[PDB]
Write a protein that binds this ligand. Structure first.
Ligand SMILES: [Mg+2]
Ligand SMILES: [Mg+2]
Length: 350
RNA sequence: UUUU
């Protein structure tokens, strides 16, 4: 539904559902959605899901290692009761193996898992996505009714741990991510700009305010790796880095949110990228690849096809899987819509 | 293009 392409000189209007949230009192996140989201980091239903996954799959893979990992918005603390649950099933100590493109061994495991879900009475198979970069099974866990995305890739679990450390260290980050997440949904932009992408933009914004560390700062070398990617981070106390941990009040949340939207309304996406790995302002698309760690340089030297896709309208770099522009699918019209909504949202916050 |  691109009116933007036809009338690029016209600001695409902020949807009313979004307008009414922004214009309305922001207290909902501070007093209602945050307690829900915090409680959803741990609930008994997750245990049932993990247990049922082990019961279902252990026969098919008779005596090999099997371990289930939870990740996604629920685990980091920005989920809601309708959120799905993302799960990484490690079969055969596959955790530390990174697959740029899903290997045949990986895809083979996924096809076998599919049949178990159909046959089982406890699960309802929804989708089988072998073609996606991260192949997943979408299935409903009928006992709890919770929709699950099952994958064989450990990177999601790894960046969920990073997010959880950030949120707990600097709770303002969590409040902001819950707000922009709901904003994104009311703006109907989730198909282009994901919740995860906007979380990285919030973290990067807060890094520029000297309230969060650069992720590279937390990885000075021993290192834990998933292929060429450094997935461990030093859980340094923010006091040790001089980072003050703010008391998140409605006024302070509202001020950072307004500055967040204002910043990305005026951000130069043509020459710069969102870079929580470097965590410094004005990180140029032209110089980013030379600022990455030796394992990336080594990895792209032998595999140039695996380098980060920088020839896109919007570049947001995953701070761990440094070869991943998480906004690579955003179109110039989708970006323009995002910019317009940011602009109009910043105004409504004053 | 589809998890994060
Ligand atoms: Mg999820
Ligand atoms: Mg999911």
């Amino acid at each position: 539904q691109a009116q933007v392409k036809a009338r690029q000189h016209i600001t695409v209007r902020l949807p009313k559902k979004a307008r009414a949230m922004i214009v309305g009192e922001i207290t909902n996140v501070f007093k209602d959605k945050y307690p829900i989201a915090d409680k959803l980091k741990v609930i008994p239903e997750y245990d049932v899901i993990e247990q049922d996954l082990c019961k279902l799959l252990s026969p098919g893979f008779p005596k090999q290692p099997l371990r289930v990992y939870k990740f996604g918005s629920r685990i980091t603390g920005i989920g809601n009761r309708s959120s799905d649950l993302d799960l990484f099933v490690d079969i055969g100590n596959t955790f530390h193996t990174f697959e740029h493109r899903a290997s045949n061994a990986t895809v083979a495991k996924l096809r076998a898992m599919r049949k178990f879900f159909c046959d089982s009475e406890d699960w309802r198979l929804i989708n089988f996505i072998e073609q996606a970069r991260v192949p997943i099974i979408k299935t409903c866990h009928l006992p709890t009714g919770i929709e699950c995305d099952i994958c064989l890739n450990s990177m999601g679990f790894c960046n969920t741990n990073l997010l959880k450390y950030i949120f707990e260290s600097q709770p303002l980050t969590q409040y902001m991510c819950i707000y922009v997440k709901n904003w994104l949904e009311r703006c109907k932009l989730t198909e282009q700009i994901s919740t995860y992408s906007i979380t990285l933009m919030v973290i990067y914004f807060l890094q520029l305010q000297a309230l969060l560390p650069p992720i590279a700062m937390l990885q000075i070398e021993q290192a834990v790796l998933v292929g060429p990617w450094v997935v461990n981070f030093a859980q340094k106390s923010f006091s040790e880095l001089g980072l003050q941990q703010l008391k998140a009040t409605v006024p302070v949340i509202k001020g950072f949110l307004r500055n967040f939207f204002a910043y990305f309304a005026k951000f130069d996406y043509e020459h710069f990228l969102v870079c929580p790995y470097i965590g410094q302002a004005n990180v140029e698309i032209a110089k980013i690849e030379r600022m990455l760690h030796a394992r990336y340089s080594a990895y792209v030297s032998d595999n140039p096809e695996c380098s980060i896709q920088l020839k896109k309208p919007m570049v947001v770099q995953d701070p761990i899987q440094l070869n991943h522009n998480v906004t690579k699918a955003v179109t110039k019209y989708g970006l323009q819509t995002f910019v317009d909504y940011c602009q109009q949202t910043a105004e409504l916050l004053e």
